[PDB]
């Protein structure tokens, strides 16, 4: 059976980056040709693998993570990056193996008046571990006094909204992102081209 890449790339809705989705791809045939045909990809690059040779490869598993960030943020989806996204929302490991694909999604993901449905975590005490997903909504404590679930001075809701508007500059427009991680265990491979 084919690996269900279309289910990930062609989904009508995408996750907010702080709650990024993950699909475990196992026991299937990875036909990365569907990726090859479309020219809509503004970002398509791989680490420790050559994207053109992907149909030649076998892995124990593939993971496929997806979410929406803003264009100026797509560069933080790479090992060793810093920023609100890399630090507090989606972290790749320093020794990542896999690919990063992204495309402009202003048409789907922006609204006249502003899309407020897409969020990122703006406040967090310390950096995410690789592939960590923090969906906490605890009031963030910025001073020494406890917030006790109440917003106020030094007590801020951790998640904030992009104001995605279709007329924003390109670097402020939403982008959809899929990260393909390739997992190689000391075990038989279940995903091949």
């Amino acid at each position, epitope marked *: 059976n084919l690996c269900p890449f279309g289910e990930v790339f062609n989904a009508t809705r995408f996750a907010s980056v702080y709650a990024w989705n993950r699909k475990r791809i196992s026991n299937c045939v990875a036909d990365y040709s569907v990726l090859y045909n479309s020219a809509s990809f503004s970002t398509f690059k791989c680490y420790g693998v050559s994207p053109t040779k992907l149909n030649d490869l076998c892995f124990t598993n593939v993971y496929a993570d997806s979410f929406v960030i803003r264009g*100026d943020e797509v560069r933080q989806i790479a090992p060793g990056q810093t*920023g609100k996204i890399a630090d507090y929302n989606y972290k790749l490991p320093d020794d990542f193996t896999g690919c990063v694909i992204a495309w402009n999604s202003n048409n789907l993901d922006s609204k006249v008046g502003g899309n407020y449905n897409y969020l990122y975590r*703006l406040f967090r005490k*310390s950096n995410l571990k690789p592939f960590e997903r923090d969906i906490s909504t605890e009031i963030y404590q*910025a001073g020494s006094t406890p917030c006790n679930g109440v917003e106020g001075f030094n007590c801020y809701f951790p998640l904030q909204s992009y104001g995605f*508007q279709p007329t*924003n*500059g390109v*670097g402020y427009q939403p982008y959809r992102v899929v990260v393909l991680s390739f997992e190689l265990l000391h075990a038989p491979a279940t995903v091949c081209g």
Partner: antibody
Amino acid sequence: VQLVESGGGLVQPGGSLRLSCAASGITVSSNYMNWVRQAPGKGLEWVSLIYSGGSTYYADSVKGRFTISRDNSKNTLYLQMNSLRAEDTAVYHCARDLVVYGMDVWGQGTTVTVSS
Amino acid sequence: EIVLTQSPGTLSLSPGERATLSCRASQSVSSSYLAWYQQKPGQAPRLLIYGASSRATGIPDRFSGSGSGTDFTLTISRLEPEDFAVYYCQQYGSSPTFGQGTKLEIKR
């Protein structure tokens, strides 16, 4: 609640200076913190930013020369300046940055004069 | 990055009048990351507005903001003698940038 900057002073072109900013009422290590400077009769210029998790950023006019850092024990923010130039003459403020909510707390600043 | 251009350089108005100050961005941006500050001579800036339109805590009622994309506005409903200072707008990309400032002076 207050931020108090220290370390400003006179410095020969090329010399080094370290600024400090002691905080009361906010936890430096838990905030985006900025150094923002203002040359006399001029506007405000952002200089450097440190994330609570440790990421740091710098304006192009000081990259390579300035280093923002902090001391959790002393609840204090620092700015290390090297290869100082006449153009760095300014009042230096630290501020607590809430990004979406702007910079709500500011210090009165400390003045740095670079001159022969 | 984003360049903020404020207009006019100097605004000459009398106490009790309405003031309108402008801030123009070189690219269209989310209004969620636009703030306004007031600075008086010799004093640290004071935050007035965040999110283009939300008045920071403690800020008197006569101050308000609006706008979207490239054009944002700070309005002072009826000027108080203390309002004649410098105002800056601020926008957040990767990091803060400020406009160059507008001086409110007393017309006479």
